[model samples]
Target: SMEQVAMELRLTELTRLLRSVLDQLQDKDPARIFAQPVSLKEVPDYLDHIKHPMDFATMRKRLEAQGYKNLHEFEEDFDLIIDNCMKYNARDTVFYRAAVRLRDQGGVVLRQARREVDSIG
Candidate 1:
């Protein structure tokens, strides 16, 4: 049944389709986020060619090297934003904030993306 569902839904289209779906149904509805698309140019470069199994600490270090003085700054900001997303039902905020962060700091994009997914989920 899961296989049939996956095939019909084309879950393979996204690397983490199930996770994304679950995350979508969590604290904030994901339809708002899904309706909008994150711009490719705005998305961080690191995410463009990243492999699996990278840790946050390692990714944070890379971002720090690239002139981001505060990893926690992004973390806290995103946390607050996510909180607001749930509070206000502003799911699109997730995409907006994510793109802004990625455009500003490409190195942290991958980890941030994962964090965002995990947070709402």
Candidate 2:
């Protein structure tokens, strides 16, 4: 059906936008701590403290797998990464502060992506 191809095309555009936002996020993390999953062996308490952990690496993998069906799904995972950081670290810690800054910048990127999607829609 033509409908199928239409949805595919939409998905392709969504993927491109998502990837662009992800690149911005990676660049935001100077320490690169949020770039990958926390080593559970090294930080044994990570799982204990953070029930649902996420990272940029896992997000990219999911994105590559086409696991995100829509922008909200992508947003959910992005929020998790920031939420996990805020939850795992103390408010005064560098990681917590980084997450705050990341949250602010990520919001800008997502909003810009939304506007782009609207313009192309």
Candidate 3:
């Protein structure tokens, strides 16, 4: 169950040894990322998206109310992710490598778009 949960988030990869297992499990799984756990519910506007967009002004206004925008929530979320890795998985597999990229290197943001290719970039 937990294995499927992690894989649904794609926290686990399908390596040669795991390819079959992935298929077997996925065949019966919905393979969807749950929504109640919307990572940054405290602040929706400051999500890790549109950081590099021309609509930054509107996004800023949307994020900021009463004449101020901030990233404290985003910072807190990242901190929690790091905390989780330290407490549970990083030593082995609590936080996936894809998630660890925030602490050390690059990472990707997978958002839904009208066309599949719209999300590819």
Candidate 4:
């Protein structure tokens, strides 16, 4: 049971890592990339085709209101965000393995995206 759970958890972690890598490579900001508000009506098709869901219209609007009007420009200015996400993804792989080991040992560990491993005991 523990192994299965750990495996599933690791899979989830891997998926996250991959997504982070792709996000980095795509180099688009969630806020300003699109021309208009991201709608659920549009997102489902994008999800089916693009394999990732865009933020909801409300969130997109909030981000746009915050002064992000052009994701391409943001990407040029903030390339490091994506670069760091990729680096973090690489680091997260090792941490994920460590987490799996800790899980197998019956130790409690907490992990966050792009963060170092933390243990309770």
User: How accurate locally is residue 113 in candidate 2, as Cα lDDT from 0 to 100?
Assistant: 78
lDDT of 1 by residue, 2-88 (tens): 888766444233234323322332324223442232334665553344322222333334343432323354345334433333443
Supply candidate 1's per-residue lDDT for 33: 45
Q: Candidate 3: which stretches are off by over 4 Å?
A: 1-69, 94-96, 106-121
Task: Output the worst ten-in-a-row residue range by lDDT, candidate 1.
Answer: 50-59
Estimate, for each residue in 1-121, the C-alpha lDDT of model 4 and write its tens digit.
Answer: 9998876665555444434433443333333332233354844453343332232233334333443332333233233322323333344574334323323332111123223211210
Runs of candidate 1 exceeding 4 Å displacement: 1-67, 90-121
Write down the worst ten-residue block by lDDT for model 2: 112-121
Residue 56 shift from truth in candidate 1, angstroms: 18
Off by over 4 Å in 4: 26-31, 35-121
Regions of model 2 farther than 4 Å from truth:
none
| CA error at residue 16 for candidate 2, angstroms | 1.1
Q: Model 3 scores what on Cα lDDT?
A: 0.32
lDDT ranking, best first: 2, 1, 4, 3
* Candidate 4 lDDT score relative to the true structure: 0.35
- Say which candidate scores most in TM-score: 2
Clashes of each: 0, 0, 1, 0
Estimate every model's Cα lDDT from 0 to 1: 0.39, 0.87, 0.32, 0.35
lDDT of 3 by residue, 1-121 (tens): 9987865433222122123322332232132211123344654653454232212223233333322112233234334443443443345552344335444421121111112222322
Q: After superposition, how far is residue 96 of candidate 4 from its true place, in Å?
A: 38
Selected candidate, larger TM-score, 2 vs 3:
2
